[model samples]
Target: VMTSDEAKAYVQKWNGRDLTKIDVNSPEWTKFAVFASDPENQAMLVSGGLLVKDITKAAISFMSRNTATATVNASEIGMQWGQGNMKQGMPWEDYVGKSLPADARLPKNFKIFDYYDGATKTATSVKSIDTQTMAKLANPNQVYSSIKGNIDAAAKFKEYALSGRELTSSMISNREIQLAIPADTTKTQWAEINRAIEYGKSQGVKVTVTQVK
Candidate 1:
């Protein structure tokens, strides 16, 4: 276990370091697993970019038995997503929205994508390769169901593409739907993920998978 102060120090020590250069079995990695296991430290880790690809891989490999893989993968994807926002110099509000256009007539409580890149007209949803998601992905009927709402949102956006309407001032034409997952996903998880991809294609959704590494 890591104390709050220790976690903070760990962030300071590893922040901006190239994870590819670090040894997976280093003592520092063990400490990182502890820091990542703590729910309270998750926000700190993400904001600090401490969950970059190599770091996430190492942390997941070294994580304690009690720590859930889902938790770590979720944080990892969020961090990776946030890093992209930073590179684009976009604020969280600029890239993420909660609602779609009322004219689209979506469900009253329909959810939107996890992140939207207005510049590229891309809608992305981040997912973790955990037991529940894997189970759904494994089932043909349930595959892609988790992201159905986002896909619907993308469809609506596409409908309004030529109408000259904007989804929050961003053009909806040529909109892209993407499913983002961690690169370190297991083979079993990949099998289910592939099913979801195939199902999405069958629906003319152009759903694509992006592995964040």
Candidate 2:
């Protein structure tokens, strides 16, 4: 609603120079920035980088007080110019198979590895890269260590399994029946269990037996 006199005066301020032709360091650049700031001038602004004093930096601090102006909003302005027609952000299809799958296969003497915290009585996959441990124990040396460790651990588990079972007459008698009985003897519960553990361990497979409560 400006009077014709004021409207004519406003148009004279540009002095016939293209807005883009103005030097970035000149005061007129500030006026040009203000001119294009409104959303209604979206098409004229188009995809352009703005270089003004850094308006986005944090308060000056001991480490870094200096700054420069830089802005990358071409895609943003372009999307608005097209009424939001561009893809909103990255689509899921780009990163589908980038990581190792959980079910990846391993050799016979290998077991899936996890770190066990003593308090939880369970283990979970290790995610950090620095602390080193074998991911798979397929090597002959590592497999032998697992075999010895599993058999040693089984000693205690067996005691729990046998606490009130039919073979609870005596611990020694139970071991004799299950672990030492000659192959020719009619197979005992202990013999089958022993064979399964031995077979699984020798092949580097992790074997667990339920407690015989």
Candidate 3:
């Protein structure tokens, strides 16, 4: 059982390091095996896209021999990794998704919000916009597909929240859609984001923007 402090230390050590370069029988691998067995440490490992394909499978093998709770956690982590290793890019969505509270569900099919907490009836969308995307938004004719898609998803989520349909078993009293953007978003970009928020209000859906680190 690795402590959270040890896990953080190991994560700092191994994050972005090439696992393929490490010898399978080395002490480093043994230490990593221990770290991987703890479900709490798995997210930090996977979030960095550090796990090579074979290493992830081997880690799962380690976890499978642990308690039933660890076995279940291992499978979910395996499923999230899927058949491929981590792809290029920062994986902002993955970061935002994992950052959500323990109660939030990262739905495989739901496109509107990256994840949602049924208890809170709140759906969240993660967006990492670049200057080019912001420039496009400045043009009225150029519809930002992400904003449009979120709006569409918000409309559907609202319907479910109101009638207690596919999204939830019971009607939600105060459903909200949160648009999460980077903390560095400029005033100009926010102005553009507000347009969608304003339109969402017109439809009776509570859409709000949040700056995430």
Candidate 4:
């Protein structure tokens, strides 16, 4: 079906009508959907929804080229429909508040951490946490920014990954810090890292940072 010129047309059909959106979570919308009475099937769909949300997993040759993963600030991206196990995560506001800018404003709290798999050189884990003065980074927004960047990078990683790149602890983010990323390193990790770096730099801090591309 993919090779047919009509494949694109079918995919276009996907955008117009997504049957998946009708679920118990959305009491209103699901009523219009063909009822999936099997709780087991519903469970599977819910789990799948949580997993394949704003995040997508491609085994590489699925598309002609990477589209979704090409985004720049994917780390902080969340599941589609903002669906998630909040118990496993936190309030988006808790992560994206004002404290980050000020704590980052402080010299002692600004530092970078890198986490990448051995093979792909794409970061699996990274942190710009404040480790000074017995405190957290003043801004919850730091978390927001960091996560968004990783989502973007992770999407790109998955895009290339679907192109027959092997999945491994080394290929995906391992969250094991190798060299701490500089607060202001702008190339990878997108915006927050750059924010941290810029703030520290503005304060005359010279950071010798190690990072993955």
lDDT string, candidate 4, 1-213, tens digits: 022233223223445454445342342222212122112234643564522432111111111121111222214433111234342123222232232332221121222222233443433323322212122244434433444454334343332232343344334432221113223232212323333333333333222223211
Off by over 4 Å in 3: 1-90, 133-138, 141-146, 158-166, 180-188, 210-213
Candidate 1 structure quality by residue, lDDT tens digits, 1-213: 466577567656766788677675565655556456443555776786666645554564544222112222334224443345443222222222333332333232234434445545555443422223445445543433555555555555432232442344244334345444555545444434443443344444556554544
lDDT of each: 0.46, 0.26, 0.48, 0.29
| Model 2 residue 78 distance off true place after TM-score fit, in angstroms | 61
Q: Using alpha carbons, what is the TM-score of model 4?
A: 0.18
- Clash number for model 2? 1
**Consecutive 10-residue window with the lowest summed lDDT within model 2:** 56-65
TM-score of each: 0.33, 0.15, 0.41, 0.18
Pitting candidate 2 against candidate 3, the one with the higher TM-score is 3
Which run of 10 residues does model 4 get worst, by summed lDDT? 55-64
Candidates 1 and 4 compared: the better one by lDDT is: 1
Q: Give the TM-score of candidate 1.
A: 0.33
User: Which segments of candidate 2 are over 4 A away from where they belong?
Assistant: 1-140, 161-169, 172-213
Clashing pairs in 3: none
Candidate number that wins on lDDT, 2 or 4 = 4
How does residue 83 of candidate 1 score in lDDT? Answer: 41
lDDT by residue (11-80, candidate 3, tens digit) is: 5665566766767556545555556643444576678564544565465464343111111122232222
- Order by lDDT, highest first: 3, 1, 4, 2
> Model 2 reaches what TM-score against the true structure?
0.15
Enumerate clash totals for all models, in the order shown. 0, 1, 0, 26
Give the poorly placed runs of model 1, Cα more than 4 Å off: 1-143, 157-165, 168-171
